[PDB]
Amino acid sequence: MADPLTPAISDRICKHMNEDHASAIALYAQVFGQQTDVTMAQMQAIDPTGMDLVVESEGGSKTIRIEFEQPLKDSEDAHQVLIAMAKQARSVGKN
């Protein structure tokens, strides 16, 4: 077989995004998660049909689901969709 996405690879990607790319995760919550007044956000998991985020705002916290348009077959699909969603979201606030 081809190599699939796994829970261990998901965890490696989520930690690298939370350590160094936290600003991008707050943008995903605002543009694709329909949240307002986001103070920060973190990736709890990524899976073949979407990702789960923890979102802080107005002194409170909540968890939300963002669904992908097409299923992910492997970690290269995951890498590509995270970069495409960030390019679209930067465009919203800079138009």
Binding site: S23, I83, K87, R90
Partner: peptide, 11 residues
């Protein structure tokens, strides 16, 4: 804000 291609498109 930083564009992702600044570190992820090597050309």
């Amino acid at each position: 804000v930083q564009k992702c291609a600044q570190c992820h498109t090597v050309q």
